[PDB]
Amino acid sequence: GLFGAIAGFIENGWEGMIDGWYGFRHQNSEGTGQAADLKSTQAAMDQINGKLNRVIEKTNEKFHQIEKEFSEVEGRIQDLEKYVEDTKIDLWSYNAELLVALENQHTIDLTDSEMNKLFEKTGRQLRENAEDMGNGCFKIYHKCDNACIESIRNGTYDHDVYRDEALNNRF
Amino acid sequence: GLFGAIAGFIENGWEGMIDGWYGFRHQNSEGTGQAADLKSTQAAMDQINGKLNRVIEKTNEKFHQIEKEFSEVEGRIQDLEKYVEDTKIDLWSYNAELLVALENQHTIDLTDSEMNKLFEKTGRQLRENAEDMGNGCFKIYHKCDNACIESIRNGTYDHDVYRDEALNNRF
Amino acid sequence: GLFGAIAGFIENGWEGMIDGWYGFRHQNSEGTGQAADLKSTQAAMDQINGKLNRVIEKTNEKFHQIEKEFSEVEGRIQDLEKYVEDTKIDLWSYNAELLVALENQHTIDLTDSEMNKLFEKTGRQLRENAEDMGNGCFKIYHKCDNACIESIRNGTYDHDVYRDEALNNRFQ
Amino acid sequence: PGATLCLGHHAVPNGTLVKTITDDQIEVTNATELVQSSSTGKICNNPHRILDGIDCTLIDALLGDPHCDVFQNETWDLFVERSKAFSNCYPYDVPDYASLRSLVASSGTLEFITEGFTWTGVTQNGGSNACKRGPGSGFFSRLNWLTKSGSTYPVLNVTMPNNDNFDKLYIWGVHHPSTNQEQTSLYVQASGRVTVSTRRSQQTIIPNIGSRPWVRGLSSRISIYWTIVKPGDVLVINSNGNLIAPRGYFKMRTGKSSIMRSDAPIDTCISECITPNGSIPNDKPFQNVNKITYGACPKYVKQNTLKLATGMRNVPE
Amino acid sequence: PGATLCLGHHAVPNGTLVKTITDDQIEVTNATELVQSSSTGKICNNPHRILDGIDCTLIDALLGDPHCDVFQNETWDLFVERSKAFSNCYPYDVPDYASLRSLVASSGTLEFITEGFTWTGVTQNGGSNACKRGPGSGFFSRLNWLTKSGSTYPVLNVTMPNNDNFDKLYIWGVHHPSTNQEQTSLYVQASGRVTVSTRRSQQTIIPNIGSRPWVRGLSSRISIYWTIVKPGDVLVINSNGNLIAPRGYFKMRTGKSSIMRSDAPIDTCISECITPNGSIPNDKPFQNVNKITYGACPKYVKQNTLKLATGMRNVPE
Amino acid sequence: PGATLCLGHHAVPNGTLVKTITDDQIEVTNATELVQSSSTGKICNNPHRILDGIDCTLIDALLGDPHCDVFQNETWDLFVERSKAFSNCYPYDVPDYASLRSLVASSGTLEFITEGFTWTGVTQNGGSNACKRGPGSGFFSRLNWLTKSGSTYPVLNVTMPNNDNFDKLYIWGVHHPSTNQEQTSLYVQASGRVTVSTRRSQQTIIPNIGSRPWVRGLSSRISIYWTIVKPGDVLVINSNGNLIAPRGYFKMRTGKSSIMRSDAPIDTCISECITPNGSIPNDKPFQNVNKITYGACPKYVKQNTLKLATGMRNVPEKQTR
Numbered sequence A, B: 001g002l003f004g005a006i007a008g009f010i011e012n013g014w015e016g017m018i019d020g021w022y023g024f025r026h027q028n029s030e031g032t033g034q035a036a037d038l039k040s041t042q043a044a045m046d047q048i049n050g051k052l053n054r055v056i057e058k059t060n061e062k063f064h065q066i067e068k069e070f071s072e073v074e075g076r077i078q079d080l081e082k083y084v085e086d087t088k089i090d091l092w093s094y095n096a097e098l099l100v101a102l103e104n105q106h107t108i109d110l111t112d113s114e115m116n117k118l119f120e121k122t123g124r125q126l127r128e129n130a131e132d133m134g135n136g137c138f139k140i141y142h143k144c145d146n147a148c149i150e151s152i153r154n155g156t157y158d159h160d161v162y163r164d165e166a167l168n169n170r171f
Numbered sequence C: 001g002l003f004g005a006i007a008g009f010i011e012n013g014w015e016g017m018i019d020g021w022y023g024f025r026h027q028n029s030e031g032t033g034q035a036a037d038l039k040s041t042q043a044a045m046d047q048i049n050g051k052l053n054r055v056i057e058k059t060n061e062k063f064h065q066i067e068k069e070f071s072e073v074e075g076r077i078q079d080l081e082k083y084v085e086d087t088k089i090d091l092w093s094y095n096a097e098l099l100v101a102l103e104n105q106h107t108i109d110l111t112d113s114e115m116n117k118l119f120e121k122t123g124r125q126l127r128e129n130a131e132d133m134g135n136g137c138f139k140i141y142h143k144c145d146n147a148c149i150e151s152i153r154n155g156t157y158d159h160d161v162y163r164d165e166a167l168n169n170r171f172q
Numbered sequence D, E: 001p002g003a004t005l006c007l008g009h010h011a012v013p014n015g016t017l018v019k020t021i022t023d024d025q026i027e028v029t030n031a032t033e034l035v036q037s038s039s040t041g042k043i044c045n046n047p048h049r050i051l052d053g054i055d056c057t058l059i060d061a062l063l064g065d066p067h068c069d070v071f072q073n074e075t076w077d078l079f080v081e082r083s084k085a086f087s088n089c090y091p092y093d094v095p096d097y098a099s100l101r102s103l104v105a106s107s108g109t110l111e112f113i114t115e116g117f118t119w120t121g122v123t124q125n126g127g128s129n130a131c132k133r134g135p136g137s138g139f140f141s142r143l144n145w146l147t148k149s150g151s152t153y154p155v156l157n158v159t160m161p162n163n164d165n166f167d168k169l170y171i172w173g174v175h176h177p178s179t180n181q182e183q184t185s186l187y188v189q190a191s192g193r194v195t196v197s198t199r200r201s202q203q204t205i206i207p208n209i210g211s212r213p214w215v216r217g218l219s220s221r222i223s224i225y226w227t228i229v230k231p232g233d234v235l236v237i238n239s240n241g242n243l244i245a246p247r248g249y250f251k252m253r254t255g256k257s258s259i260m261r262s263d264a265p266i267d268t269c270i271s272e273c274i275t276p277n278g279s280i281p282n283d284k285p286f287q288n289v290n291k292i293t294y295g296a297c298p299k300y301v302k303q304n305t306l307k308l309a310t311g312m313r314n315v316p317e
Numbered sequence F: 001p002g003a004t005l006c007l008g009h010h011a012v013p014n015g016t017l018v019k020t021i022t023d024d025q026i027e028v029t030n031a032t033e034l035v036q037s038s039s040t041g042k043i044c045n046n047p048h049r050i051l052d053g054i055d056c057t058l059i060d061a062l063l064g065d066p067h068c069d070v071f072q073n074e075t076w077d078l079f080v081e082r083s084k085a086f087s088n089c090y091p092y093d094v095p096d097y098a099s100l101r102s103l104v105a106s107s108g109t110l111e112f113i114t115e116g117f118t119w120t121g122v123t124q125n126g127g128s129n130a131c132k133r134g135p136g137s138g139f140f141s142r143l144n145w146l147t148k149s150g151s152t153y154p155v156l157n158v159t160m161p162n163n164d165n166f167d168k169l170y171i172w173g174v175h176h177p178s179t180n181q182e183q184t185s186l187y188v189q190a191s192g193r194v195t196v197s198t199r200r201s202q203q204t205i206i207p208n209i210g211s212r213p214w215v216r217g218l219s220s221r222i223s224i225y226w227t228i229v230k231p232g233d234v235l236v237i238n239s240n241g242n243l244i245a246p247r248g249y250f251k252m253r254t255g256k257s258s259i260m261r262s263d264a265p266i267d268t269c270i271s272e273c274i275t276p277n278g279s280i281p282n283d284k285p286f287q288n289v290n291k292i293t294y295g296a297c298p299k300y301v302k303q304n305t306l307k308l309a310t311g312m313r314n315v316p317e318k319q320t321r
Ligand SMILES: *[C@@H]1O[C@H](CO)[C@@H](O[C@@H]2O[C@H](CO)[C@@H](O[C@@H]3O[C@H](CO)[C@@H](O)[C@H](O[C@H]4O[C@H](CO)[C@@H](O)[C@H](O)[C@@H]4O)[C@@H]3O)[C@H](O)[C@H]2NC(C)=O)[C@H](O)[C@H]1NC(C)=O
Pocket: E157, E158, E159, E234, E236, F178, F179, F211, F212, F213, F214, F219
């Protein structure tokens, strides 16, 4: 994708994450763990539902039309009737092909974008108390118990609290 | 949008900014103030004008055509005439709907992108003399009088001048 | 473009680079030099070839159709035959115009994106041993001989090796 | 002694391939199908009024072929003609059959109003063994075969004004005998003529004497014609022989009605969209079942499958 | 003691809704309307040449119905037929009326060139009280009702070659008497025939005798036909009765001309695009006013509004 | 004393302009053309079977005009009619010419099967000096001009059932004499009639006596009609004068066959797509050569050029020159 997170600097996805689309894996003092990020999962799903509902908008209801199958050869009028229908079908077939291609490229790019957005939001939360390893992971330069991890995940991490400790571990 | 600035990490827009589309609010020693960024405002407007002029390119001049309203019931020939017109109108109505949807998604994304571009240009100007608070605002770690703010805004801020001062305030 | 690298923070391209689409220029102890980045060059080319092959997919074959030129004035039936063809042609002409416009905007944006991706991959490799000048260039804050440059380019640069040296050169 | 916080995204063991602008195949976590390619095989009887023609074409029900009498005064949103349908009355042709079938199908009704035409000096209600009605000879229910009275067939000259506020459809015909013997025996005069006119149009038909191929015993034929009479206008029928007279008019409507050729059986279920293969669901925007449709239908396309990605790019491990 | 530098973007108190790929409604700072949905109610008289038919259809002006004589040799880019138009001459029909109307409309002119046809042994210039001219009876100006001279109507056999570099349109007709009495009284022979041919094609019409509803005093009718004769080809007319002869040809052009049904008044103003509802501006790419248009027009679509976003997403305070 | 590492991208000396959503002209490193705008001027003779009509329209070859006899039993994927084609037989018209031409073109064959029609009490094989076949008078090869035998033209009543499993196309006609003298001299009766019928349909044509324009010596004409007889159906022809009888039927097919008006010469080469201007390559998705095409063709569009960007945005170093 355009943002280079999914199938980019994040080497691969997590089959083990089944309660969300994006999220967090940590290793700290107290062991390892995993949590879904709800907000970014919701943003992606909401955008995808939005486009799904636009595509499946019932928009044509047709009643009496032209004949499209013929049991007798007739010539000129029938040639035109067939050509009109074959023209129509080709144009709609093209619309359908283009639509999915554009939609799918865009879906891949917005999902890549939501990953990247979560990664930057997190980096900005951690200020100078952490460093981007370049593979989707932050090395945090202070003691971060399970309470501290949940604080990063649930949006309440005050960086000033750990800053002096972390600045010294870095430099 | 795809970049997550507008309706993302920037909580909201400024109704009070009426001389530009993007810009700067500061608090320093000498008080508060506001200025438009002309370059990013222009880039967005210019792209939007470009696409507007492509969409309104006069392209259709038609003279004698088929009849589209009929006072008598006729059957086969009239069925075909109506079906031809109704096919055409549906295909153009679809083109119109798709066009606006693609254009509008793209307009939202390029405007979001211009915001993000201004934010990164600024971050890069400030080198190690400032920090991204994560909400669209930089905390600058030195004395920045009104002359210094205008220097950031008008592109002339030499970071080396304030670096020692700022490095020490940070660490 | 949407990412602001090409015709953005990178002032211009390099006519002198003829063995790749993206890459590296360095100035160190031992002089100046230039190398193509193969991976980013390949990603862009592969995406562009992919879209080219989709657009040129041969997908219509037509045999007996309607007449489209007429030697006699006939009225109603001929008006409809002509109108059908003129409707068709206008719709396909529009499809063709839109297709190139969307494709070309997207091509410009993916090439801009690949530049930006290479720039961030590099920034992340260099950790705290370098700084973004803001013009596409990193100032590296340590001795980086030609072996060290190739290590950055070929993906093997251990930042920990030069970190102490560099951290001290950065902060005073 | 630090901690590591990794950002990531899900993956699944078995993703689906989709198309994009740049790739004809690329793997995503999930997708949904946009082309309806299957049908029940059955035409749902709601919410549209389906009228199964069974053994009858619409035109045979219009004219009133005896095995089609059950369709008298019927209405429909969709009339369904079956490949087993047959004619079993006087052999006939309709110049511009396709138009008559279309306009009737579209009117959505066979509602017929008998009018008191006065046929002075001819015999009414002629019948043929080719068109049995019960045990004896008969004819199309909505047509009146007129023949000589005693030894004369006078000039028929009759009028029926339209003083209603709706259009009237009149169906009428001309008889084409096989021999001169039959012509003069039935109509006295050696050459018939039928002229049907309004203020705004006229049709004059000369019968054609000669053999055609034998159908249900007969080398003669009837040709069927129609005339619409608008409010304030007037029908005039003028003939010195060979007239197959109308008995009245059909009431015309406009609306959502149509006709479809299909052998799919009718079932008790609910479907907005009908094809000849049967009803199809209309939740998807496209369909590949049949280009012939009626109702709220997906648009017909040539592709049998198109997948819309409903998730991110799938990168397993 | 530092400083805070905040980046941001504008907003407005009341934005506009647009549609996108993902949202049916999302609010932006500004948008522009792409569907023209209103009209002045008036057809602008520039830059196209508008010809108001007033009481006349194009066909009545073509044939030369007396109240339409003012249209003789009239030209147009767009002929406008009004719902009040009426016929007031010999009652007639045109088989394929729609085509004749189309080709004449498209030619853009009624310019007529009289040719010296030689009708040997018949009376010319027949008239009827159904088509009054001055105090007496009259006829279509461009047609010549031919009847017997003395007690004979000979075989008429005439030729008119096209040695010009333009197409010639010939308008002619066939007379349908109401009785045999009138057929023989006018044309001697009991059955007329009209054959009009060029080198590669021909039309042969047999008249139809019979009673029809009274129009302007008459039960009889004329049927109108046309023949186009290309450069280097030749017209032949052959008839032993019932010919309504041409007096000449109409000179054909090709170009931008057409015809429209409308009751909108014509006004002094400038509009490239004309609809039956009146003129509309063409600055927008789409329009919902009418699918019938003439000129440089927006394309007709079903939506009454479509908004193109001309600014960013609006997020007020 | 450290080091500087600069990231960048290529540029080229001569880029190309393309269109995008936001710009009608913007420069990229490379692009490729999507509209085929040229042709060789020549119709390639493979892989489709091309039949050059030379001096003959399909209809003249159908009817069997003597200079078109070489086309007897021919087949084609594409029949090519030339602007030099001419008729040289009895002057005729075809009501609904366009349809007959279409259905024959589409059938892709002139394969003809003679049938033993029994015309009792008339003279067969009439000929005219307007339709020379060798030195003497002649007629269309697939039609049989029937005239009186002695001093009578009886009512003709003949049948030909279709007991095959394919459709039969019968071509027949009606003769329109110029004078009553000619009518009665040829057909005895003062007024002819031709009725051709199957089970569900019938056509009746009354001839019309009168002059038409002089063509190859004649002011008379023949009008051509057709009747298709399906398997199990039966043809009946009934006439007391003026019948131009069929000699048989043409076998009908369905397939990829068509017809095209063109003066392009046919050449030895391979092209899937044929236009009247000549063959064109089909590697590009669009074409501006001609809206009339046959085969695997690019779709016709009005633009003569459309450029697809095949490279990044081209940004040269700005110069002070
Ligand atoms: C009905 O009206 C038309 C018009 O009066 C009439 O048709 C014309 O008849 C004449 C005489 O038959 C035709 O003359 C021919 O013209 C062509 C030139 O285009 C010449 O090639 C012919 O020349 C040869 O044949 C003549 C034998 O008749 C010789 O006299 C002559 O020296 C040459 O050998 C020939 O002169 C004329 O073309 C037609 N015109 C048209 C438009 O048809 C028709 O005959 C009349 N019908 C009746 C029953 O009177």
